Amino acid sequence: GLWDPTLPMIPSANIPGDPIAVVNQVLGISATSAQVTANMGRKFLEQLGILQPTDTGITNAPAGSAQGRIPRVYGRQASEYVIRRGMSQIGVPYSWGGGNAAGPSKGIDSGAGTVGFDCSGLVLYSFAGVGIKLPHYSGSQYNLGRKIPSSQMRRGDVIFYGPNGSQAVTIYLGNGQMLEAPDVGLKVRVAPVRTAGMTPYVVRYIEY
């Protein structure tokens, strides 16, 4: 009962640090997920009319704090943009280790020749749109943001599975549905929430 038994019962792909997310051979440029995320964060803060010269564009709250860069009054807008980004990826193939802040990508190991998303890749891609920077490993994502009891999960909160949230991570959509990049041969999908292996807390990255 420690893991979700419908998926491989192993820790999710763990891709270290700040990977290159964009490579443009023609212009001769490349950039990492953090750079892509910061740029989107600044664009988002500008769209809210609140961009400051001190803003890098990274909007994460210190882990456990109920206050991040994005004002509470704009949290629902931020959350809905994150969800829109994720939902726009329905139908993209699964790839073990796949995805970065710029979109689906080549995976690692088994997924090395497959462009797509895995669980943490999809979540980090979605949240990057408002400057929320997340590591490409579900266990590490579980240690950021603010814990909410799972019984009180709310649309936009992030659901975790397995010990230390190491197996999988999905975005709660409300109404008992979640957005996930589940397993090989499947695609990014909306599916019923599964409680087997669920961590006792979900994580909130955006307050509203």
Backbone φ and ψ of 164, nearest 5°? 60, 20
For residues 139 and 199, the answer to whether their CB atoms sit within 8 Å is no
What angle do helix axes 119-128 and 33-47 make, rounded to 10 degrees? 40
Q: Say which DSSP state 116 is in.
A: E
- The answer to whether 203 and 64 are in contact (CB under 8 A) is no
Superfamily of domain 1-208: endopeptidase domain like (from Nostoc punctiforme) (3.90.1720.10)
What letter does residue 71 receive in the DSSP assignment? -
Instruction: State how far the Cα of 101 lies from the Cα of 123, in Å rounded to an integer.
Output: 9
Q: Write the burial class of residue 31 (CB in 10 Å: 0-12 exposed, 13-18 middle, 19+ buried).
A: middle
DSSP 73: G
Q: Which residue has the tokens 């599964």?
A: 194
* DSSP code per residue over 157-207: -EEEESGGG-SEEEEEEETTEEEE--STT-BSEEEE---TTB-SEEEESS-
Phi first, then psi: what are they for 198, rounded to 5°? Answer: -65, 135
Asked whether 130 and 41 are in contact (CB, 8 A), the reply is yes
